[PDB]
Amino acid sequence: LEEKLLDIRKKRLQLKQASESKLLEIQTEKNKQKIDLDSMENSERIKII
Amino acid sequence: ASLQDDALCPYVCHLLYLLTKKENVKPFRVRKLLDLQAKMGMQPHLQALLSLYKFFAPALISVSLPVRKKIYFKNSENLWKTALLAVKQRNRGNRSGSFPLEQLQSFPQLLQNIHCLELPSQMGSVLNNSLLLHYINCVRDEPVLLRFYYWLSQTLQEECIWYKVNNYEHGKEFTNFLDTIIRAECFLQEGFYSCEAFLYKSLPLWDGLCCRSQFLQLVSWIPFSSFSEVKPLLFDHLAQLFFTSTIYFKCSVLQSLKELLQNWLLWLSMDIHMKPVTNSPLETTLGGSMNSVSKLIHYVGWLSTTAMRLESNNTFLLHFILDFYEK
Amino acid sequence: STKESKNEKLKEDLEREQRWLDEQQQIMESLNVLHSELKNKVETFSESRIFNEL
Amino acid sequence: LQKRLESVRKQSSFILTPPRRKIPQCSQLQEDVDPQKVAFLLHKQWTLYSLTPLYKFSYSNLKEYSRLLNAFIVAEKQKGDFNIKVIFSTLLGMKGTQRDPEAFLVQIVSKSQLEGKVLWTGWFCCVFGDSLLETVSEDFTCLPLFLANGAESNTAIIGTWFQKTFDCYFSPLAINAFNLSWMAAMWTACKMDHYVATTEFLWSVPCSPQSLDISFAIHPEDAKALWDSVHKTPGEVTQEEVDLFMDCLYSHFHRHFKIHLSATRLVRVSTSVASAHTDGKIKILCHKYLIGVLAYLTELAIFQIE
Numbered sequence: 125l126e127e128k129l130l131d132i133r134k135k136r137l138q139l140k141q142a143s144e145s146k147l148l149e150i151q152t153e154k155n156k157q158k159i160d161l162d163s164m165e166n167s168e169r170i171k172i173i
Numbered sequence: 174a175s176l177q178d179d180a181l182c183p184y185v186c187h188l189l190y191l192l193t194k195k196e197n198v199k200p201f202r203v204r205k206l207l208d209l210q211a212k213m214g215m216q217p218h219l220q221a222l223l224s225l226y227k228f229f230a231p232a233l234i235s236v237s238l239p240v241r242k243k244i245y246f247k248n249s250e251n252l253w254k255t256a257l258l259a260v261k262q263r264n265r266g267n268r269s270g271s272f273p274l275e276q277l278q279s280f281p282q283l284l285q286n287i288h289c290l291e292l293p294s295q296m297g298s299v300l301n302n303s304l305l306l307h308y309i310n311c312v313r314d315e316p317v318l319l320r321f322y323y324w325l326s327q328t329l330q331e332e333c334i335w336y337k338v339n340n341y342e343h344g345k346e347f348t349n350f351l352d353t354i355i356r357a358e359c360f361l362q363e364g365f366y367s368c369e370a371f372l373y374k375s376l377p378l379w380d381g382l383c384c385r386s387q388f389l390q391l392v393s394w395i396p397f398s399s400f401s402e403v404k405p406l407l408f409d410h411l412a413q414l415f416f417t418s419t420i421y422f423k424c425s426v427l428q429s430l431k432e433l434l435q436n437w438l439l440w441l442s443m444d445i446h447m448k449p450v451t452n453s454p455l456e457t458t459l460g461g462s463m464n465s466v467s468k469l470i471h472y473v474g475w476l477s478t479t480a481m482r483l484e485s486n487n488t489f490l491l492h493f494i495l496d497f498y499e500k
Numbered sequence: 501s502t503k504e505s506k507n508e509k510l511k512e513d514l515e516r517e518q519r520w521l522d523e524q525q526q527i528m529e530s531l532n533v534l535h536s537e538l539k540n541k542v543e544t545f546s547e548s549r550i551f552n553e554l
Numbered sequence: 555l556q557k558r559l560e561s562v563r564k565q566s567s568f569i570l571t572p573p574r575r576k577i578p579q580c581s582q583l584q585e586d587v588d589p590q591k592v593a594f595l596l597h598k599q600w601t602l603y604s605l606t607p608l609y610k611f612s613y614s615n616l617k618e619y620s621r622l623l624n625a626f627i628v629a630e631k632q633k634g635d636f637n638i639k640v641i642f643s644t645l646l647g648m649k650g651t652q653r654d655p656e657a658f659l660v661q662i663v664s665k666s667q668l669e670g671k672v673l674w675t676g677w678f679c680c681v682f683g684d685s686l687l688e689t690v691s692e693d694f695t696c697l698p699l700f701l702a703n704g705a706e707s708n709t710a711i712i713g714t715w716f717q718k719t720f721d722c723y724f725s726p727l728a729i730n731a732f733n734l735s736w737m738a739a740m741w742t743a744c745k746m747d748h749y750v751a752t753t754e755f756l757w758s759v760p761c762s763p764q765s766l767d768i769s770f771a772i773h774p775e776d777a778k779a780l781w782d783s784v785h786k787t788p789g790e791v792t793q794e795e796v797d798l799f800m801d802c803l804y805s806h807f808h809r810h811f812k813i814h815l816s817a818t819r820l821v822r823v824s825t826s827v828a829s830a831h832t833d834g835k836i837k838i839l840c841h842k843y844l845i846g847v848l849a850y851l852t853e854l855a856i857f858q859i860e
Contacts, residue, residue, distance in 0.1 A: 136524050140362070143310070144312075146535060150538060160544065288538075324723055
């Protein structure tokens with residue numbers, strides 16, 4: 125049961141490191157979509173409306 | 174608009190409580206009920222209606238309210254008492270913003286919204302919620318870890334054991350606070366930077382008793398460092414208590430060091446895998462990690478063959494020496 | 501008495517890290533479907549759409 | 555983060571105080587330093603606290619923070635009319651190191667129902683606190699030392715607000731009885747040509763069921779002629795200069811009363827410069843040597859955090 129628990133602990137470390145790198149890629153994609161949302165909101169004649 | 178009649182005023186505001194949405198909270202309806210608070214004073218049907226308005230839209234009201242324990246209305250299941258008083262009684266006169274932390278009730282509410290999660294008003298509520306412990310596992314931001322260092326180092330320093338007037342009730346709450354730490358270090362699989370900084374200042378000041386089992390599990394989940402930094406701060410002050418205390422302490426050191434040999438070798442087994450960044454070969458870094466752990470086992474192996482001479486061949490220590498070499 | 505209590509601790513530890521592996525896989529299956537919806541929604545609404553809708 | 559690691563190992567080792575210290579210089583008041591503000595800071599009773607460095611602190615968001623503090627401390631008195639209003643006043647020119655952040659003042663001034671009476675005074679500062687500046691980021695604002703004037707119930711209801719906004723925590727400050735002897739030797743190392751008070755010491759006997767206090771007064775012209783016979787290396791105050799100065803004061807007490815006061819505990823040092831107490835009570839009575847004492851209080855305030 126100790127080698128089963130240590131195999132569960134190694135799989136928990138691998139899924140935790142994969143979720144950490146995936147949330148790092150998602151937050152860099154979120155900053156990329158923030159730069160694209162700031163870039164796609166340029167207008168001059170909209171302020172009177 | 175039925176609030177102009179004063180005799181119907183608790184009867185209107187209970188119907189206003191059950192029919193309020195987010196779009197129904199309007200700033201002129203803030204303005205009239207603050208004028209009714211100034212004219213006819215504090216009434217419990219008007220304070221409970223503004224308590225729901227602070228529960229729905231706090232930004233529209235500039236007047237803060239108390240948060241005291243009141244029943245606010247008819248409640249607590251009194252439907253037979255309502256029917257007895259119904260005969261003749263009281264009938265004559267894409268979003269880049271943030272998500273609030275208090276709306277997380279269960280597990281799938283955080284699974285739908287993890288990319289927008291705000292920061293709380295204190296760092297003591299991170300240990301209270303297990304849903305906030307999932308946020309620490311995947312975020313490697315710098316000021317969210319330094320503010321957690323600035324809180325819990327002040328928690329272990331002021332509310333410790335020997336800084337008090339020897340209260341057994343506050344030591345039970347300090348034992349219950351250390352049970353939160355040893356489940357948080359195992360769920361994270363790295364020790365906190367507050368917790369190894371407290372053991373730098375407490376191992377000269379510790380004698381060997383007074384919640385020994387919560388202190389020897391606090392040394393069990395310390396992360397990996399160099400061998401020359403640990404030995405003046407830990408291994409000198411451990412060996413002053415190891416050869417001199419009882420044999421139940423001598424078995425509990427080697428149960429703590431076999432869990433220290435678990436979590437140090439678990440980090441070094443996958444540090445090779447997650448680093449493709451350095452173009453230099455890692456045989457100097459693994460060779461610098463080779464003599465850090467081979468002098469670890471030969472120090473505890475020097476602790477094992479010297480303490481055998483102290484007790485003169487007892488088998489009860491000899492079961493837990495060979496459990497350390499199982500690792 | 502100290503190894504059977506180590507067995508009774510580890511059967512309690514057999515429940516908790518299996519629950520912690522079940523939570524971390526539930527993080528892993530939910531971060532996969534939020535990565536797929538973010539990759540499919542890289543392109544936002546158009547610049548000419550905002551002028552004609554408003 | 556790597557300079558945060560190197561500041562732990564000086565605290566984890568036993569050495570934290572240098573044995574040879576510098577005599578503090580004559581801090582002249584500049585033209586940028588307000589003369590009418592520093593007279594209000596003198597002759598006041600203060601309670602010291604140490605604080606972790608703040609988060610998202612800006613110098614232009616003080617108008618919003620003045621309205622949130624005035625809406626909360628009235629509400630904490632209602633949970634348990636008030637014509638009170640807080641003033642966030644900023645002071646200039648107190649710093650000697652250019653990398654220190656700007657200190658400021660927090661008052662509670664009552665309104666005119668007929669200048670109002672000041673009920674509470676808070677003061678955040680960082681004087682020569684350069685060792686904690688490279689251990690924090692540039693987003694953090696490092697003001698470790700805090701001084702309070704007023705009731706402790708008004709301190710806790712405003713200290714609740716810094717816990718729930720700036721992510722910090724107040725801790726009580728305490729000065730050891732070993733460290734009262736160094737600041738008494740620094741106050742006898744001063745230069746004076748004016749009106750002076752009396753050097754007052756007070757010891758407490760720990761080996762009693764009751765309290766036992768001894769008031770002890772030294773004339774400062776007699777203290778200056780006692781100092782320079784001990785002080786033989788100019789420019790530095792050494793380890794052996796202070797411990798022989800305390801031994802000849804104990805041997806002066808020993809030939810009269812035969813009571814060893816070296817087993818006792820020094821708790822109050824009051825000289826011509828300032829008065830001190832071990833639980834954080836201070837009374838600064840001088841303006842020429844103002845920042846020399848306050849840099850020594852930030853020398854202790856970083857040590858209780860780290």
